Amino acid sequence: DLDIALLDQVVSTFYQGSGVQQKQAQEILTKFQDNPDAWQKADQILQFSTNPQSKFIALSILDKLITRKWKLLPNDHRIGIRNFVVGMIISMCQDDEVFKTQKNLINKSDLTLVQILKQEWPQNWPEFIPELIGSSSSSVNVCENNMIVLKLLSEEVFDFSAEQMTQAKALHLKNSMSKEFEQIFKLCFQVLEQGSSSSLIVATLESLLRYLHWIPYRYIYETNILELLSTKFMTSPDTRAITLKCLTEVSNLKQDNDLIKRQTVLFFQNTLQQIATSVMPVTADLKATYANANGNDQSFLQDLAMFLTTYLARNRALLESDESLRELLLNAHQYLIQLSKIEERELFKTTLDYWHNLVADLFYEPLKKHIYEEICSQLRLVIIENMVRPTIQLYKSEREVLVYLTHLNVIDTEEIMISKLARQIDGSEWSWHNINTLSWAIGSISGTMSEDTEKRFVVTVIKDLLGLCEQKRGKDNKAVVASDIMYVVGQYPRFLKAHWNFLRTVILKLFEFMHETHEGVQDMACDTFIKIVQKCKYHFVIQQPRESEPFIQTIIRDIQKTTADLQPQQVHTFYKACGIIISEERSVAERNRLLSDLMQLPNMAWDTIVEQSTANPTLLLDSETVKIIANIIKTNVAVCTSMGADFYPQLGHIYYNMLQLYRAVSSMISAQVAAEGLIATKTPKVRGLRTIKKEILKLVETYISKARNLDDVVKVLVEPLLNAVLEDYMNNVPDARDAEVLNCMTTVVEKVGHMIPQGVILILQSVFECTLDMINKDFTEYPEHRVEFYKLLKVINEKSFAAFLELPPAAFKLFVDAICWAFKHNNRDVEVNGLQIALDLVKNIERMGNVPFANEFHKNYFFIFVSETFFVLTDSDHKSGFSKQALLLMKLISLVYDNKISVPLYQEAEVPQGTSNQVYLSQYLANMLSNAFPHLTSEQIASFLSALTKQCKDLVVFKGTLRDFLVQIKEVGGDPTDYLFA
């Protein structure tokens, strides 16, 4: 047997060692732990060993034995292990040296005892709770450790039971503790009032925190426990932290009685007075306290914020009527104000969620907002000074609260911002960071003031902001202010729409800033330009009073000098902006010529190049010619993005030549793959060519996805596109096939697929079999083709299901293999598309009726789908898709118990004639689960399948039965009567 002293060195080399010595001791300590019969030697280690880490590891070996193979043991092993553990815990509670220096070992010992109670209590241990309470009076050390036993028991029964045990087993344990709680609460209340050991008091409170997660309410409001928590235990910093968490849980408990209301007001009153006298007063600067991080100050301040907001969000109304409670109400809120100035973002999100709850109520509920006028006045400054750049989610919350506060009192919000702006001009609070946050605040409340107050406010802010730029020296300083002016003017469109002369000046200024070489200014100028265009499109398309032409024509005609020094991506944004304006023109001929004038420069460059490139070409080996082409197409993509169906005239001007260019670029990529190998696909020259193809496809996808005239799409667009892209995809090596081809065909099929049945057939024939072979050797290679492959099969199965009926039988068999192949992916997008295609497919076969194809489908593939779904359900490696797996399985089972499958699913040669599909299904399933899970008894599989089939029309219950099956296959000996739970 075991050389225990050798063990105590293996474990010490592992925990305290280093290098390869630790790595080898690692792999042998695992081998000792996962030996199936090492639990038999836990007898020796727990009693002979001198190393607590070995006693911890051995208790680990016991826990796996207890949770998964308990009921397989001969009975007297079950009581030899039980009596042991009970004896070891008692033994470690009298040795005051082991009880204070080996906490890890005693907690691990209590957990192992709780694992036994889950298996044996109370049906085979009815004396446990009365016995545990007699032992509490014998020793203070035992009383404390019994509180650890009870805390861990409530945790495993109410807080972590739903995933780990069956519904019947968990309900049994919950009922057992509920019947025995009056006894536990008597002992817990005695310890709390008679003191006095702090380590015993904290262990009692930490277990009371667990009880509050469910115990009835009468135990809390109809005893003296609330005044104990709200007074006696708030004074000592040992019990304060856990007491605060208990009063937090009480503020969420299971309320009409007029006396429960006074108790709810009472413990809140006591708690905050203790905070005032024993921790810190209401005027203390909690920002500095949190920043100093002394002791548990940060944790306490985090718990105070959680307690205040929780109680205030539920019971605020209890304090707003009575005038004796007014000081209590606003003092609690002044603590929140002080907590809100702590620079710790996760905490700030906690208080900001409550402020939202508050200011929404004041904006809607009558006769409330006058109470919190000074609270709201402070809250205004707190948020203006912490405005973030527009986490994106935190800004929307900061804006929502600030907008509510402006409605509650416009005048105070206006002066705080003007005062904060003046302190920027005099220079006391001047900073790049401080002027940016102030602008974001001034921009966020846009549209909440009245139109004429907003008018006077905007001009005041803009006027004084301009003097700031005049007064600063240096570009770094002037660029920061110039950016903030443009941000503000862009944020107030309702002001720009009513004063055309000012709007005309801003745009000419943005055009000016586009020739600025400084960093970020051109990006700021373009972002603000398109931002102003989306909200004031109409004022560029009409002839503004006292000018000769729509301002769009002025923008268009000198577009080349305006965009002369931008980067291509910035130029594409500009063209997209002009496309927004042109779509506002609802006269067709007037819109189509604005489109012609806008596209003039890229149309000119496109024409030469098609010319001097068709006739040649080789020019497309030019690095520079490829870049010129890509940016011409990208400019078309930008304008088509914002114009949609109105883009069609420009598309026809370039469509056929674009598809020809697509063909030519497809040749050269194939040529340089042949001349230099597969590594050519990585070279810059070929990557520039693939960009042209991807950008051409993107332009065609962008249009069709937004097209309105669908007859034009089918008549002129689809058939030249399919000839250009499908054959080139099919006859290229897999490492040169563009996955965007699949994405383009998905968009085509999704919008016009019902009108092109022969086009769908040719899409399947060209991409199905050759792409399936790219992705059916592993789950790794070609992640892009993988995702797009199943997006295409999904929409084809939704829009043109007849395309799968014209597949040869060998090809249809490949379609089913690909659907099951998708089940086994862990990639989230592939797996949910896979289960969807299966579910959409059985409904496609169902609505066909009693026809040879439907019958043969059930004969060939029904049980394949039943067993492939059962495999991903029960292997613990696909638990992200449990919902879709259960639903697909339910549709499969219900199909048989509704006699929608007319053919028998079996071969006449294998069972008496006249046997119903229901009976054979229960037999196929019974055999399948027995071979896959041999440790299950025959009664388990029979009762599970009995419950599973009689519940195939109730999803929530069905899911519960599958979850119960997933727990019992993790152990040995589960009770088959657990499937009668519903």
Binding site: L466, K478, A482, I485, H499, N501, F502, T505, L508, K509
Partner: peptide, 16 residues
């Protein structure tokens, strides 16, 4: 109307 403001912003500059 506010051409007083429009001419100030028209003067906004970043260089010098």
């Amino acid at each position: 109307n506010l051409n007083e403001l429009a001419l100030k912003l028209a003067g906004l500059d970043i260089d010098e």
